[PDB]
Design a protein around this nucleic acid. Structure first.
Ligand SMILES: [Mg+2]
Length: 665
DNA sequence: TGAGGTAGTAGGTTGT
RNA sequence: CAACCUACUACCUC
């Protein structure tokens, strides 16, 4: 429990809502064709937009801060694809209270609309959504870069206004598709139809004749889409989604959409540009003078991290020794021309295993994957002589090969860590992270936490995989007393939402893992989800925990939405806790401007401080980080990576991989 | 594939 | 319409 500190957030307080904004006008709606089922809301919101003025939806009909008489109370609209005649009917005004969150919800919405709408008419200003740009930063040959900020406006509990502000840049081009080539520019990886709004991943060009299943130049004009311009026919792109077959379209009806290559704010300058814009907006909108909102920060007890002895970053366990070594064999695979183990790597590993008192063996695989099945027999044999993981020296592999090889070894129970081939002793940070990764893949506890924490078990949950279906998975850190890191077999699912039965099952695996290292159940576990928790996702798992008499806390850990945190005076410390609302706090562990982790206590009865403590500390357990800690707790960072990697290479291989070998780092 | 991060550019899922 | 998440790319950092 370290020392206080005062900080201000990237929010500001503005003028109290006025007697007229506290009593919104109410209006019912009437659509014809009469509304559907789940089509009502995505549309009742779109009618607030069409109606005009500052109006947002409020129940079955919308609310408005503008009088009905200055609204388009009747008009026409088209939705999913139908002409819907509408008519707004007035039904008096109904006051709202900031204290009553349900209603304060609406005020904040009107407030967000007021924000845009007022911005919409500031001459000399581009409003792309709730974000605004008000300074040019640089230019080129039709390629201009706008400065500005993204912002939100909501209502406080004291019936006052709140404005969140954060600097941003924009990239904008003028020249058409072929008009961008008139500049001599290179092939924009992406583009977007002016006529439509679709973004095509431009593939290449072609001398192919336009007049030459469909007739290009001809049918293109059939939609009367030949007017306005034409230029060089050029590209025959492909749907970014189904990105194979070629579906060509005229390069007169595409607008070039530029990117980074085809400018980084120092926090000191961001805290400046933030206050500037804040003032500016309150001034230009009659919202008043911006009072920077400030909150109490807290410095958090630095973690005591333990190799064989105390250590400050995982890499140092390389010279001190490991929190827990064991007899370990490690094989080598060379996909370049060379034969033996680079001596400095040989030395480096001995020096570390010496220091630990544990015994090492350094095998070599004399085989190439080119051999086919005979190569798998080579693996079968090394795994037989007790190799636990392999290092692979190789020039940069391609994704498709890289995956195939990784997946191959895992089929023989062998985790692999690639180290790319042009390699020199001085590239020390490279190969030491490669070494840590190899040892983690071998099953070794590199470092752990000395300390006492509320929960002896910490499990992270994530879901992911590019494809049509996802995986839901869990990693975990066993025993408060440092950690033992484990992964569990993920399970395939339709969406991001992990199924309840599945959450509990993965959870139960973590529990059982704990039971088998300490002959007892854990008294309390710490549950970590990445991002918003899908409502009720942990329903069963929590009830199940209860009936087993295990204490719990669920925390939602978000990487986005933490906003910004600035020092009132001085420099900010690495480990800062910052309670916000109720049940929600930030955590900052940072040559740019940092993003705080936003954390939400979704369940359980534990001091936000206590949780922030563990969490921040788990940040240090990640064994392949090396010379830098991940922003997220080791057990969550792991679940994130495992789920990604089972995504990349499929679940069928992991049958025979020891759950203590972190193969995915 | 060494790894942590932020920052531009795309975009998908959950949810009322 | 919010709240999160993803992928590229470019930079930094050890
Ligand atoms: Mg790795």
């Amino acid at each position: 429990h370290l020392g206080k500190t005062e900080v201000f957030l990237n929010r500001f307080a503005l003028r109290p809502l006025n007697p007229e904004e506290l009593r919104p006008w109410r209006l019912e709606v009437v659509l014809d064709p009469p509304p559907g089922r789940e089509e009502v809301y995505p549309l009742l919101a779109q009618v607030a937009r069409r109606a005009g003025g500052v109006t947002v939806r409020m129940g079955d009909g919308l609310a408005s801060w503008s009088p009905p008489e200055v609204l388009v109370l009747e008009g026409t609209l088209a939705r999913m694809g139908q002409t819907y005649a509408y008519r707004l009917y007035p039904k008096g005004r109904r006051p709202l209270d900031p204290k009553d969150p349900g209603e304060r919800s609406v005020l904040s919405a009107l407030a967000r609309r007021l924000l845009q709408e007022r911005l919409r008419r500031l001459e000399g200003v581009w409003v792309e959504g709730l974000a605004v740009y008000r300074r040019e930063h640089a230019r080129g040959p039709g390629w201009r870069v706008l400065g500005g900020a993204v912002l939100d406006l909501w209502v406080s509990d004291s019936g006052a206004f709140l404005l969140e502000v954060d600097p941003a840049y924009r990239i904008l081009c003028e020249m058409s598709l072929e008009a961008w080539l008139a500049q001599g520019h290179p092939l924009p990886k992406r583009v977007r139809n002016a006529y439509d709004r679709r973004t095509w991943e431009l593939l290449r060009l072609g001398e192919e004749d336009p007049k030459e299943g469909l007739s290009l130049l001809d049918y293109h004009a059939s939609k009367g889409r030949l007017q306005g311009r034409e230029g060089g026919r050029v590209a025959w792109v492909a749907d970014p989604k189904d990105p194979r077959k070629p579906i060509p379209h005229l390069t007169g009806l595409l607008v070039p959409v530029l990117t980074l290559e085809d400018l980084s704010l120092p926090w000191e300058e961001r805290r400046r540009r933030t206050r500037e814009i804040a003032s500016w907006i309150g001034r230009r909108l009659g919202l008043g003078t911006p009072e920077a909102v400030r909150a109490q920060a807290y410095r958090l007890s630095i973690p005591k991290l333990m190799g064989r002895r105390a250590v400050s970053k995982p890499a140092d366990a390389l010279r001190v020794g490991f929190y827990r070594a064991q007899e370990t064999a490690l094989a080598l695979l060379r996909l370049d021309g060379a034969q033996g183990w680079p001596e400095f790597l040989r030395r480096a590993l001995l020096r570390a295993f010496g220091a630990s008192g544990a015994s090492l063996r350094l095998h070599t695989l004399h085989a190439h994957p080119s051999q086919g099945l005979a190569f798998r027999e080579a693996l079968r044999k090394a795994k037989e002589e007790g190799v636990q993981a392999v290092l692979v020296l190789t020039p940069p592999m391609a994704w498709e090969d890289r995956n195939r090889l990784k997946a191959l070894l895992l089929r023989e129970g062998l985790p692999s860590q690639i180290l790319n081939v042009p390699l020199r002793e001085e590239e020390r940070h490279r190969w030491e992270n490669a070494l840590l990764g190899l040892l983690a893949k071998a099953g070794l506890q590199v470092v752990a936490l000395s300390g006492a924490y509320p929960a002896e078990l910490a499990v992270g949950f994530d879901a992911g995989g590019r494809e049509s279906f996802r995986f839901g998975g869990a990693a975990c850190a066993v025993g408060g007393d440092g950690g033992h890191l484990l992964w569990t077999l993920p399970e395939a699912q339709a969406g991001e939402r992990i199924p309840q039965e599945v959450v509990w099952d993965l959870l139960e695996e973590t529990l059982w893992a704990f039971r088998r290292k300490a002959g007892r159940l854990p008294s309390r576990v710490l549950l970590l989800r990445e991002g918003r928790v899908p409502q009720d996702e942990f329903a069963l798992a929590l009830e199940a925990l209860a009936r087993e008499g295990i204490a719990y806390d669920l925390v939602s850990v978000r990487k986005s939405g933490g906003g910004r945190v600035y020092p009132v005076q001085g420099r900010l410390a690495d480990g800062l806790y910052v309670p916000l609302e109720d049940k929600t706090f930030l955590l900052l562990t940072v040559r740019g401007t940092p993003r705080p982790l936003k954390l939400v206590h979704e369940a359980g009865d534990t001091p936000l401080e206590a949780l922030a403590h563990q969490i921040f500390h788990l940040t240090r357990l990640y064994p392949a980080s090396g010379f830098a800690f991940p922003r997220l707790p080791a057990p969550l960072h792991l679940a994130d990576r495992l789920v990604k990697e089972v995504g990349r290479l499929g679940i069928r291989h992991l049958k025979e991989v020891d759950r203590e070998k972190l193969f995915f780092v």
